[PDB]
Amino acid sequence: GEAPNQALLRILKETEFKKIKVLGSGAFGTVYKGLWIPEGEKVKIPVAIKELREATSPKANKEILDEAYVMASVDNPHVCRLLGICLTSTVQLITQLMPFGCLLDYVREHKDNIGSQYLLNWCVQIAKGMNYLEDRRLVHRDLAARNVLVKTPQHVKITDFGLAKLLGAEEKEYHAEGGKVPIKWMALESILHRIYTHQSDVWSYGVTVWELMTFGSKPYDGIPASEISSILEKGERLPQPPICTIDVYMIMVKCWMIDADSRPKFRELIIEFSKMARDPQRYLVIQGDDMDDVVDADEYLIP
Amino acid sequence: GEAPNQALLRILKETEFKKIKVLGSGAFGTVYKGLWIPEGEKVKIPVAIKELREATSPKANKEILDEAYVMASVDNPHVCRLLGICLTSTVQLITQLMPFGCLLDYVREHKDNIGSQYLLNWCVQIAKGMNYLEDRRLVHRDLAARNVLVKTPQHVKITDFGLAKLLGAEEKEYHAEGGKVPIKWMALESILHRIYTHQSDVWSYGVTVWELMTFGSKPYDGIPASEISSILEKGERLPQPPICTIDVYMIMVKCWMIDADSRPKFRELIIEFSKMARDPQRYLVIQGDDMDDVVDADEYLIP
Ligand SMILES: OC[C@@H](Nc1ncnc2oc(-c3ccccc3)c(-c3ccccc3)c12)c1ccccc1
Numbered sequence: 226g227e228a229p230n231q232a233l234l235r236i237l238k239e240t241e242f243k244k245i246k247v248l249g250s251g252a253f254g255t256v257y258k259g260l261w262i263p264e265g266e267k268v269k270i271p272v273a274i275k276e277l278r279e280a281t282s283p284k285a286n287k288e289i290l291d292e293a294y295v296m297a298s299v300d301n302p303h304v305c306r307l308l309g310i311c312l313t314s315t316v317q318l319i320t321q322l323m324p325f326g327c328l329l330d331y332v333r334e335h336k337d338n339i340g341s342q343y344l345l346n347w348c349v350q351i352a353k354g355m356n357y358l359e360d361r362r363l364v365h366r367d368l369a370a371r372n373v374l375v376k377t378p379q380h381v382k383i384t385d386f387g388l389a390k391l392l393g394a395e396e397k398e399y400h401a402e403g404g405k406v407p408i409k410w411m412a413l414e415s416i417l418h419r420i421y422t423h424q425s426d427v428w429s430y431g432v433t434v435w436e437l438m439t440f441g442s443k444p445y446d447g448i449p450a451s452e453i454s455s456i457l458e459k460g461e462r463l464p465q466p467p468i469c470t471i472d473v474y475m476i477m478v479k480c481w482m483i484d485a486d487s488r489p490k491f492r493e494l495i496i497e498f499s500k501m502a503r504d505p506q507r508y509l510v511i512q513g514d515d516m517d518d519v520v521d522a523d524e525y526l527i528p
Numbered sequence: 529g530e531a532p533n534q535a536l537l538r539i540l541k542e543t544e545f546k547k548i549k550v551l552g553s554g555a556f557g558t559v560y561k562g563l564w565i566p567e568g569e570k571v572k573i574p575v576a577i578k579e580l581r582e583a584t585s586p587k588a589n590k591e592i593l594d595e596a597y598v599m600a601s602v603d604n605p606h607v608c609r610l611l612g613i614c615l616t617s618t619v620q621l622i623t624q625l626m627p628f629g630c631l632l633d634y635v636r637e638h639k640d641n642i643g644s645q646y647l648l649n650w651c652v653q654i655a656k657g658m659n660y661l662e663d664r665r666l667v668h669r670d671l672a673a674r675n676v677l678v679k680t681p682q683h684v685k686i687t688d689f690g691l692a693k694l695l696g697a698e699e700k701e702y703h704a705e706g707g708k709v710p711i712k713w714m715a716l717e718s719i720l721h722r723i724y725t726h727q728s729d730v731w732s733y734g735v736t737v738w739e740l741m742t743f744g745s746k747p748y749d750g751i752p753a754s755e756i757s758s759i760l761e762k763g764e765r766l767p768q769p770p771i772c773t774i775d776v777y778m779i780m781v782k783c784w785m786i787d788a789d790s791r792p793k794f795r796e797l798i799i800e801f802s803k804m805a806r807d808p809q810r811y812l813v814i815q816g817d818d819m820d821d822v823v824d825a826d827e828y829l830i831p
């Protein structure tokens with residue numbers, strides 16, 4: 226009836242891996258940096274180890290397992306995949322370490338050294354990952370610069386599948402209920418009707434691109450989430466970033482059409498950004514890529 | 529009778545240049561970082577501005593002017609040259625800013641990123657500068673890693689001519705009297721008889737090279753300057769640095785022969801280090817240029 230999910234859920238022993246340092250700790254528990262050393266092999270795999278707050282909330286324990294189900298069911302160079310789980314007091318999620326952290330923080334603390342080639346290549350990679358998830362029938366529902374991690378400066382992967390949902394063969398959209406989704410990244414239909422689709426992800430992809438192009442600006446910086454619904458209905462959108470040619474900014478605007486089907490598909494976004502990646506300075510204008518009368522002393526020969 | 533020194537001593541107005549920041553302040557007064565803006569031109573020259581301690585010692589004021597005389601009389605890509613002096617309360621020496629500071633500090637705080645190409649190229653450049661000073665009939669008497677400055681990582685210049693002395697046409701050596709010269713960089717004959725020659729500079733060049741090859745180690749670290757004379761007489765020399773092939777270390781040892789004329793000339797040191805610079809990894813072994821079983825998670829495919 227539907228394609229049976231034959232993903233393997235690997236169960237890891239706690240003695241196999243070693244926590245080196247804490248990486249971060251929000252309201253989702255704590256993420257550790259560590260090494261995973263399978264006893265049989267002669268390998269040492271750098272891993273990120275996520276566990277919820279020491280306590281046990283019935284609902285929160287289930288949701289980590291949902292995140293495990295989706296991560297275990299994905300396999301793509303531009304998507305983060307689960308290595309396994311460890312069944313300790315609280316369940317631990319284990320994945321490949323992305324040492325350079327989330328892309329939002331990366332663009333912020335490297336503004337001065339990020340060229341148009343990297344920006345456009347990241348857009349291509351995120352589009353490929355999202356396109357893969359579309360093929361896998363998966364709606365992410367939380368795509369943002371913060372949920373894209375950096376393996377190396379030239380290789381990024383999508384992560385954070387805690388809100389992700391699998392769509393059936395005879396199913397085109399997901400209907401939420403609980404809410405509490407980041408308002409500033411979601412499509413109008415999702416705010417107005419809690420409808421989520423692959424094209425809702427495209428909206429979020431648009432906002433994710435805006436983040437990258439503005440080197441990590443906060444969308445609608447001065448605006449409270451209550452108003453967001455209203456301003457979108459009126460036709461107001463995120464502004465054109467300084468470095469963005471109309472060509473690039475038109476792609477972003479297309480992701481934010483009211484009609485979801487009028488928005489571009491991830492496969493089309495791969496093509497368009499790929500074309501642009503071939504001649505990146507034609508599409509992004511960055512000054513890099515306090516005086517200009519300065520001359521070195523051994524070019525100023527004595528008069 | 530002797531070649532008349534027709535060097536031009538430029539006198540600069542204080543209003544022409546602007547102190548931005550203090551760079552350092554030992555027992556030689558203070559060195560400022562600044563910009564020099566000749567009124568007529570549309571240029572802004574980055575300069576280092578040296579002045580003695582606010583007060584006026586009769587002997588100390590003379591010695592700054594001696595340093596000005598020698599710096600003003602030199603013109604070579606690998607030697608620091610005086611731009612001018614400013615006749616304020618205390619005399620100010622003005623020269624080209626070498627933004628990366630002295631080479632001793634540079635090798636120390638970049639151990640991990642200094643390759644054999646840079647090390648050997650620096651040796652060539654210092655040899656060229658010293659060879660130029662030899663042609664100019666100038667004995668430096670204070671060559672060390674600390675007295676070589678860095679314009680860029682790939683371009684260094686010799687500086688600090690406070691102890692330098694001009695030799696006459698019919699003159700092969702200088703006889704000091706006051707003393708107080710860095711003992712660990714000077715040749716045996718200079719310690720034993722206060723004799724200084726171009727070949728005494730070669731000894732110091734040998735020690736300067738040892739500093740670079742050991743990434744800024746202090747020569748005879750545990751030894752007090754009183755003993756230095758004795759250990760050299762016995763035949764003890766600075767040890768072979770870990771990264772140094774016998775080829776390179778033999779050059780260093782040759783600079784430390786008792787017979788000054790047995791030591792190599794700077795022109796020969798230019799040639800030898802130049803040859804080596806063409807195939808630098810044959811002559812310096814640096815690991816760059818905590819586990820080795822580490823494999824990235826997306827090269828460890830699930831068994
Ligand atoms: O977002 C959850 C995701 N976290 C990471 N995953 C891989 N590699 C990472 O690297 C950093 C990281 C590395 C260096 C500096 C900062 C962060 C974080 C990570 C850690 C804390 C919060 C968010 C991401 C991180 C995760 C998901 C499932 C299982 C474990 C971990």
Ligand SMILES: OC[C@@H](Nc1ncnc2oc(-c3ccccc3)c(-c3ccccc3)c12)c1ccccc1
Binds near residue numbers: 551578621677688
């Ligand atoms: O050694 C005296 C020499 N000094 C420098 N000269 C050029 N460029 C420099 O750059 C730094 C420097 C720059 C950045 C960090 C640290 C040092 C120093 C310099 C400053 C203080 C002591 C020694 C050298 C320095 C000098 C000689 C004559 C006139 C002025 C200055």
